[PDB]
Amino acid sequence: QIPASEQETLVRPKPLLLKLLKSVGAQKDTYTMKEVLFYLGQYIMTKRLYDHIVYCSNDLLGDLFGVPSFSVKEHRKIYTMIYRNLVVV
Numbered sequence: 001q002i003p004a005s006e007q008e009t010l011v012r013p014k015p016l017l018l019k020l021l022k023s024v025g026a027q028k029d030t031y032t033m034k035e036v037l038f039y040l041g042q043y044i045m046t047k048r049l050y051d052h053i054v055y056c057s058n059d060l061l062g063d064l065f066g067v068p069s070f071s072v073k074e075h076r077k078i079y080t081m082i083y084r085n086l087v088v089v
């Protein structure tokens, strides 16, 4: 059910993820996970990979996550895919 505390986690995205974030406006070295989820979420809507599965097999999101798609309901899984592209602060 995940803890609310997780969204407060401070993180430094690796180069590729930092590249995705910068496309929806991000301009920081370090982010809170809340910011990361919001910016990735706008990356997903503005680019219609979602309308409850997200389709990214032909996008760098797909490259960063290592999957051609994923269910937006699987939060623990999404969290694990995101941490592979960042370092905690």
Ligand SMILES: CC(C)(C)C[C@@H]1N[C@@H](C(=O)NCCN)[C@H](c2cccc(Cl)c2F)[C@]12C(=O)Nc1cc(Cl)ccc12
Pocket: 037, 038, 040, 041, 042, 044, 045, 050, 054, 072, 073, 074, 075, 076, 078, 079
């Ligand atoms: C464009 C969108 C797909 C509708 C946005 C997404 N909506 C959220 C959700 O759970 N919707 C169910 C309805 N309650 C989802 C989400 C929110 C908070 C934590 C997690 Cl792990 C999460 F998955 C969301 C998000 O906010 N950011 C985000 C980032 C990635 Cl990489 C995948 C999915 C998301």
